[PDB]
């Protein structure tokens, strides 16, 4: 019953359908794949620094576009010729829809409502893709002309260094301009402020004043949508993406409990940025923080599943790793599972044959029950400036030393098999090199496990877990090694 | 004013006054030093595994003691000879007081009230000092005879491995027996359950079950004190010492939010274990979690101030650094500063001449205002089993890299001098080796700072901070180095 909130990004549909002359009929068909599933809400993202629709207050993606011209035109000049082709696909497809008198977002919305989906607009508040290229096609002229409006003038070590500083009146006005336009143009059920594109909105050190500013911003947005409620004659929701732990959220100027208690938002999505889905997020704590506010708390997944920040693997979640994260977060009280980067092609799970199943299963413990699942140890990609970072992997165990890993496996397993699986880096073990316990109980050595992808490029050793040992929620792997070892991977595989 | 809560431990008074034949008058005079200070409660601890008073349900510290005998006697046999002298100091003074018809806790409670100090009893729930010595004097016979009731059978790498398992009925009953006697024998204004001696109460992996069990335990205790309120004809307060972060507290089976909401407790002490004071604890989050409960949230300080876990430095807080931590924790909403291990001797601040000063200043922003303070970067010593650990120091910065450190410095500085001071390990810089910024602002190179204790044993470099840079709450040091450098210390010195 909690269900699925699914984010469709600003660029995907225009990139993947480039070169077909899209009919209103085909545009509508995109909403159909999500109909009759556990999907309750599609969050349709129309923007980055530029809009994918023909905006009158902001730059459409095709501003500067010579549609008859060659790939090497001023708008695309700054990309390598190969990347001009990909980018021109997004730009041209978007442009050609506007010329055909097709407003893709008014169409998708209309169609969502026939097919029993609540349609949302999700706004990227501070996208900074490719800001290392000040000539890039997808930056706004406002950004290009106002370097003084950026977060970090003294260094460029990351893209967020060039993000807009919302400590500026001109920056808030610039994004309130697009919100004012989206509310007037589209009759949506809700607006999602996606603060997590890219998460960083203030001068380093100013995040306190930042919190006050983003609360006063959200209140002004709530007060705008209250006027549209009258003009439309139905409730319009306001929701927000925010980081996965409450110290990080407030430390990045997002005091969400305040937003919540002031009825400024009615939905919050705790999520990582990108680098990996978090399989472990403190939902129980967020629920206590939000008690009596009537906000719906959603646990946000990302498509990547990676063991540690410096890992060279860039594989995505599978149906089994997503039922793993789903089971867990629902168990911990998630009122929605929110999918970001799980689209129908290109940016998507690699086991794309399983997408129809996924959208029919991960929105409920009922439909996850008695299905194979994988609970993988990952990491939080996002931390406030100077905030101590808690990263479990990789983990070194010296001879005679103990290391514990807690993994959230949500509902107590059904009758069947449980494996605790540990990958070892550095090119090794025998059956006794590791002593492994789960919740104190000795686990049998199984041998080398042949994982399905997502999997590491190093040996994964399996240990059979007494079923009785496994608990609701966190389950604790403890290991000791008789040889020095580095762990780069840890998961529970549960096979009812 | 928020004021001070000060904890007197189970052993200190008996160790330090050993060899004096204490009269009722001297016993009473121990309270008087705290009279006229900002101390609002004394938290009088009467126990480790054994009581320091003449208990009839538990072992007094002197069970098995031969008062006339040599140091080389069974109860003391297992210690080195010179350590027998210290232990017999505690055993004999405790014993000799009982023999003189002096109940030290009854005398302190009554003397507390005469001096306008609210007397509390603080019980150590699971003290495990010297559990490596199975024959040690201060273990209860009940512990020695029941190894099956300990937390971890399958290894012995830390003292907490031999702590009692509160998952067992027998363990709970053992601890409820002492609580029932404490409530009958002493007329205290409140009891504190000190979970944080030593914080580890459950088999590894059983902390969820644990949380239900400690809530019910707390509930019986509240119901017990409800009866004694009628018999005493006043309110009896119930409180607890819990870890510094909600996720660590709940992962060690302490759901203080549930305790607070159900009116089981009215005070919560968020505290480190021992290895260092935390100068940074998320007070603001705890206040939001506890909103509408009426629970007085106390920020716990410890006496040691150490930059990281593996540091060989074991220096205590000074007046300046307790001013710093106090100013920070009150600014963020601490409704009391709670001092553990800040006694009148032996276990005490190294600058003990400043102890009278400390007791009259650290319980109010007003009395701290315009006085020199030191805000030192430390760490959280306590993490739930397999909980990823966030530890800021030490921190390596490679040539051209940026490292950030957030230090909580509470109220905006008054006119004067603000130094960001950074210690560098490994044996050596020039004035242009570090570019140092606070909230973006270039800090002038000051040179070597001669820190008073507590201080690192490696060079400390000062950086003059433009006054107007400094914000209320966190202030961000950002540093980049022209050469690879390890940071072992960071603080803000504020010198109005
Ligand atoms: C085809 C492609 O790369 N799509 C990427 C998309 C795109 O870069 C953006 O829409 C530009 O605005 O961004 C994101 C993102 O996590 O935000 C993920 C997608 O993989
Ligand atoms: C003299 C001495 O060492 N006292 C130590 C004391 C003692 O061990 C305990 O009271 C015995 O039960 O314990 C603590 C403590 O932080 O727990 C700190 C004291 O410095």
Apex A428 CA angle, A427 and A430, nearest 5: 165
Reading the block at residue A4, the tokens are: 């699925």
Chain A residues with CB under 8 Å of B388 CB are 379, 390-392
Structure tokens that stand for B7 in this block: 């904890």
* Cα–Cα distance for residue pair B284/B271, rounded to 1 Å: 15
Q: Which single residue is written with the structure tokens 């905030």?
A: A387
Exposed (0-12), middle (13-18) or buried (19+): which is B78, by Cβ within 10 Å?
A: middle
Contact criterion met (CB below 8 Å) for B315 and B305: yes
Q: Is A204 within 8 Å of B440 when comparing Cβ atoms?
A: yes
Length of chain A: 496
Ligand nearest to the backbone CA of B52:
2
227-246 in A: which are within 8 Å (CB) of B? 245-246
Distance B12 CA to ligand 2 centre (A): 7
* Sole residue written with tokens 């059983």: B206
Decide the pairing of beta strands B444-448 and B460-464.
Answer: antiparallel
**Residues β-bridged to residue A8:** A44
Q: Sign (positive/negative) of CA torsion A162, A165, A171, A175?
A: positive
- Which residues between 11 and 40 in chain A have a beta carbon less than 8 angstroms from any beta carbon of chain B? none
B157, B205, B480 member nearest A439 (Cβ): B205
| CB B250, CB B208: distance < 8 Å | no
Q: Which residues contact B369 (CB under 8 A, 6 or more apart)?
A: B411, B414
Q: If residue B13 lies in a helix (H) or strand (E), which one and from where to where? A: helix B12-16
Structure's resolution in angstroms: 1.9
Distance of CA B286 to the CA centre of its chain: 17
Nearest in space to A267 (alpha carbons), one of A307, A286, A295, A291: A295
Closest approach of B122 to chain A, Cα-based (Å) = 28
CB burial of residue A395 (10 Å; 0-12, 13-18, 19+): buried
Q: In what order do the strands lie in the sheet with A474-481?
A: A402-408, A474-481, A434-438, A441-442
Q: Does the beta-carbon distance from A247 to B282 stay under 8 Å?
A: yes
Contact status, residue B354 vs residue B360, Cβ threshold 8 Å: no
Q: How was this structure determined?
A: X-ray
Starting from the CA of residue A94, give the closest ligand: 1
Nearest by CB to residue B385, choosing from A203, A251, A476, is A476
Residue A205 contacts B, CB cutoff 8 Å: yes
Nearest to A476 among B246, B386, B478 (CB): B386
How many cross-chain Cβ pairs, A to B, lie less than 8 Å apart? 131
Alpha-carbon span A395 to B388, nearest angstrom? 10
R_g of chain A, CA atoms, integer Å? 23
The number of helix segments (H) and strand segments (E) in chain B equals: 14, 18
Distance from C-alpha of B172 to C-alpha of B175, rounded to nearest angstrom: 5
Ligand 2 contacts (CB < 6 A) are B 9-11, 15, 48, 127, 129, 138, 274, 341, 346-347
Is the beta carbon of A475 within 6 A of some atom in ligand 1? no
Chain Cα centroid distance, residue A39: 16
CB < 8 Å to B250, chain A? 284-285
Report the distance separating Cα B267 and Cα B259, nearest Å. 10
Test A208 with B389 for CB contact under 8 angstroms: no
Ligand 2: centre distance to CA B60 (Å): 17
Do A299 and A306 form a contact (C-beta atoms < 8 A)? no
Tell me the ligand closest to B273's alpha carbon.
2
- Tell the burial category of B353 from Cβ atoms under 10 Å away from its Cβ (0-12, 13-18, 19+): exposed
Please, which residues bridge with residue B70 across strands? none
Angle between helices A207-232 and A169-185 (to 10 degrees): 20
Say which residues have a Cβ less than 8 Å from residue B41's Cβ, sequence separation at least 6: B5, B6, B117, B118, B119, B120, B189, B190
Alpha helices in B135-206 (DSSP H): 141-145, 169-185
The full DSSP string for B130-142 is TTT-TT-TTS-HH
- A440 to chain B, any CB pair closer than 8 A? The answer is yes
- CA-nearest of B173, B51, B215, B37 to B121 is B51
Inter-chain CB proximity B204 and A440 less than 8 Å: yes
Tokens 């950026």, residue?
A: A150
* Nearest of B489, B414, B416, B418 to residue B459 by alpha carbon: B489
Contact between residue B32 and residue B40 where contact means Cβ atoms under 8 Å apart: no
Q: How far apart are CA A131 and CA A118, in angstroms?
A: 34
Angle between helices B24-32 and B104-114 (to 10 degrees): 50
Which of A379, A399, A381 minimizes the C-alpha distance to A391? Answer: A379
Q: Looking at B377-459, which runs of residues are DSSP E strands? A: 395-397, 402-408, 417-425, 434-438, 441-442, 444-448
B285, B439, B480: residue with CB nearest A203: B439
Q: At what angle do helices B283-290 and A283-290 cross, to 10 degrees?
A: 60
Closest CA to B270 of B237, B299, B238: B299
Whether the ω angle into residue B394 lies within 30 degrees of 0, i.e. cis, is yes
Contact call for A157 and B257, based on CB within 8 A: no
Specify whether the CB–CB gap between A439 and B173 falls below 8 A.
Answer: no
- Strand, helix or coil for residue B168: coil
- Are the C-beta atoms of residues A93 and A18 closer than 8 Å to each other? yes
Q: Which of B431, B432, B425, B415 is nearest to B466 (CA)?
A: B415
For ligand 1, atom 19, the nearest C-alpha belongs to A347
Distance B11 CA to ligand 2 centre (A): 7
Which residue has the CA at smallest separation from atom 10 of ligand 1? A11
| CB neighbour list of residue A401: distance below 8 Å, 6 or more residues apart | A480, A481, B157
| CB nearest to A388's CB, from B284, B386, B391 | B391
Closest CA to A418 of A335, A495, A333: A495
Cα–Cα nearest to B483, from B430, B437, B419, B440: B430
Report cis status (omega within 30 of 0) of the bond before A198. yes
Q: Is residue B395 within 8 Å of residue B403, measured between CB atoms? A: yes
Positive/negative CA dihedral, B403, B404, B405, B411: positive
B398 touches chain A (CB under 8 A): no
Strand partners, A337: A4, A299
Domain boundaries, chain B: 1-370, 371-496
Distance A14 CA to ligand 1 centre (A): 12
Cβ contact B285–A404 (<8 Å): no
- Which pairs with CB-CB distance under 8 Å and at least 24 residues apart come from A140-149? A140/A49, A140/A50, A140/A58, A140/A59, A141/A59, A141/A63, A142/A49, A142/A59, A142/A174, A143/A49, A146/A170
C-alpha gyration radius of chain B: 23
For A196-284, list the strands marked E by DSSP.
237-242, 267-270
Separation between Cα atoms, residue B130 and residue B48, nearest integer Å: 11
Whats the size of chain B, residue-wise?
A: 496
In 10 A of CB B270, how many CB atoms?
26
Rounded Cα gap, residues A206 and B472, in angstroms: 10
Tell me whether the omega of the peptide bond preceding residue B119 falls within 30 degrees of 0, making it cis: no
Do the beta carbons of residue B267 and residue B239 sit within 8 Å? yes
How far A318 CA sits from the closest chain B CA (Å)? Answer: 25
The Cα A423–Cα A485 span in angstroms is 10
Atom 13 (ligand 2) nearest CA = B9
- How distant is the Cα of A151 from the closest Cα of chain B, in angstroms? 10
Residue B72 corresponds to which tokens in the numbers above? 């080389």
The phi and psi torsions of A246 (rounded to 5 degrees) equal -65, -30
In 3D space, the residue among B77, B57, B81 whose CA is nearest the CA of residue B65 turns out to be: B77
Backbone angles phi, psi at B119, to 5 degrees: -85, 130
DSSP-derived 3-state class of residue B107: helix
A251 at interface of B, judged by CB pairs closer than 8 A: yes
Partnered with residue B434 across adjacent β-strands are B481
* Token output for A451: 């994982």
Measured distance between the N- and C-terminal CA atoms of chain B, rounded to whole angstroms? 22
B207, B289, B404: residue with CB nearest A204: B404
Query: What residues of chain B lie within 8 A of the CB of A246, using their CB?
Result: 282, 285
Nearest alpha-carbon partner for B392 in B412, B376, B373: B376
Instruction: Give the DSSP per-residue string, B294-352.
Output: --EEEEEE-SB--SSTT-----B--HHHHHHHHHHHHHTT-SEEEEES--SSSSS-SSG
Q: How is residue B216 written in tokens?
A: 């019910």
Interface contact B155-A288, CB threshold 8 A: no
Asked whether the bond before B198 is cis by omega within 30 degrees of 0, the reply is yes
* Helix ranges restricted to H, A39-152: 81-99, 104-114, 141-145
């Amino acid at each position: 019953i909690p269900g699925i909130s699914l984010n469709e990004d600003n660029s995907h549909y225009f990139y993947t359908r480039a070169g077909r002359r899209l009919s209103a009929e085909e545009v509508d068909s995109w909403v159909d794949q999500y109909a009759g599933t556990q999907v309750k809400e599609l969050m349709l993202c129309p923007n980055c620094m530029r809009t994918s629709y023909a905006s009158q207050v902001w730059d459409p993606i095709w501003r500067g576009y010579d549609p008859a011209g060659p790939d090497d035109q001023p708008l695309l000049a700054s990309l390598p010729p190969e990347e001009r082709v990909a980018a021109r696909g997004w730009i041209h497809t978007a442009w050609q829809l506007h010329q055909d008198g097709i407003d893709i977002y008014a169409r998708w919305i209309r169609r969502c409502r026939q097919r029993g989906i609540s349609p949302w607009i999700s706004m990227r508040m501070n996208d900074v893709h490719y800001v290392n290229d000040e000539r890039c096609f997808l930056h706004s002229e406002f950004w290009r002309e106002n370097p003084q409006l950026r977060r970090v003038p003294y260094r460029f070590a990351e893209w967020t260094d060039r993000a807009f500083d919302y400590g500026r009146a001109e920056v808030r006005e610039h994004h309130l301009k697009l919100i004012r336009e989206l509310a007037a143009r589209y009759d949506f059920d809700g607006l999602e402020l996606d603060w997590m594109r890219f998460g960083f909105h203030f001068r380093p050190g100013y995040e306190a004043e930042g919190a006050e500013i983003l609360t006063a911003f959200t209140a002004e947005v709530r007060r705008l949508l209250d006027d549209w409620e009258k003009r439309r004659g139905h409730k319009i929701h306001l929701g927000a993406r925010i980081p996965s732990r409450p110290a990080t959220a407030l430390g990045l100027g997002m005091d969400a409990v305040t937003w919540a208690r002031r009825g400024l938002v009615d939905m919050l999505v705790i999520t990582p940025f990108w680098a990996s889905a978090e399989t472990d997020m403190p939902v129980e704590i967020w629920r206590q923080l939000l008690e009596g506010t009537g906000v719906t708390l959603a646990a946000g997944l990302e498509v990547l599943l990676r063991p540690y920040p410096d890992s060279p693997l860039f594989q995505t979640n599978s149906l089994e790793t997503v039922r793993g994260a789903a089971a867990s977060l629902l168990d911990r009280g998630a009122q929605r599972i929110y999918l970001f980067n799980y689209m129908d092609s290109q940016t998507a799970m690699e086991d794309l044959e399983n997408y129809p199943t996924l959208l029919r299963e991960i929105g409920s413990l009922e439909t996850l029950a008695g299905k194979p699942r994988r609970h993988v140890l990952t990491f939080a990609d996002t931390w406030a400036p100077g905030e101590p970072r808690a990263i479990p992997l990789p983990a070194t165990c010296r001879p005679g030393e103990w290391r514990a890993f807690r993994l959230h496996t949500g509902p107590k397993p059904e009758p069947g098999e449980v494996i605790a699986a540990l990958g070892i880096e550095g090119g090794a073990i025998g059956p006794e090199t590791l002593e492994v316990r789960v919740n104190g109980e000795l686990c049998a050595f199984l041998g080398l496990v042949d994982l399905s992808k997502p999997r590491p490029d190093f040996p994964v050793y399996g240990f059979s877990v007494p079923l009785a040992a496994m608990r609701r929620g966190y389950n604790l792997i403890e290991v000791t090694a008789r040889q020095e070892l580095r762990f780069g991977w840890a998961e529970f595989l549960i096979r009812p």
